[PDB]
Amino acid sequence: TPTIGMIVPPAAGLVPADGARLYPDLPFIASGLGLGSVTPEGYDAVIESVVDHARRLQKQGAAVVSLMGTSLSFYRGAAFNAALTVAMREATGLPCTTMSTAVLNGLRALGVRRVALATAYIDDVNERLAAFLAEESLVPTGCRSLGITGVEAMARVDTATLVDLCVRAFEAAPDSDGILLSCGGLLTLDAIPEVERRLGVPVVSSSPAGFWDAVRLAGGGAKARPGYGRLFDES
């Protein structure tokens, strides 16, 4: 059974709880970046830090590495994500991926072209992720946010609150094939099937999608626990 390595933003470097539950029998390890919003040391220093943490995971026995950070994966667009992926792969000799690649793969697997975006965080996250999706020829149809800033760190948002968010996002953009939920706080898994039940359209949650994508990359053919929505039920 291959170990799955994840690079996460906070220095604490914990494996995210919101996804680990999908795969209770698989070993995950994580390495935390601790980077600031801006890094005065410059662009090379940011890339070096990502690459160093990928090496650390390789040395600790990871069989694949996923960059599980929203800003690094999405905020500079798809070409940057691809270049950083190759830099990671060339640094480690391991299959490497990211959260944005995972989200693209999830929406593709579900046949989603027109997407409504929802977040528990600020508008800017939806705008960045929408621009990224649009550049990849998907069609953002609408954006809804809760504005809870603490979700950039340790905040947990109630399932019912996340469900209302996604439902209202879709009702405002009812011409959508599906919904992308990002920055939803510590736990989002429970909202997914409930939203899908109420709307009849699939939901991709960015962090759980990164788990699914890494497990797929790993090549074991392990299935997620059932009951967490179309993407995980079907793969």
UniProtKB/Swiss-Prot annotation:
It catalyses: 2-aryl-2-methylmalonate + H(+) = 2-arylpropionate + CO2. Gene3D superfamilies: 3.40.50.12500. Disulfide bonds: none annotated. It comes from the Bacteria. InterPro entries: Iso_Racemase_Enz_sf, MaiA/AMDase, RibuloseP-bd_barrel. Its EC number is 4.1.1.76. One of its GO terms (molecular function) is arylmalonate decarboxylase activity. Signal peptide: none annotated. Keywords: Decarboxylase, Lyase. This is Arylmalonate decarboxylase.
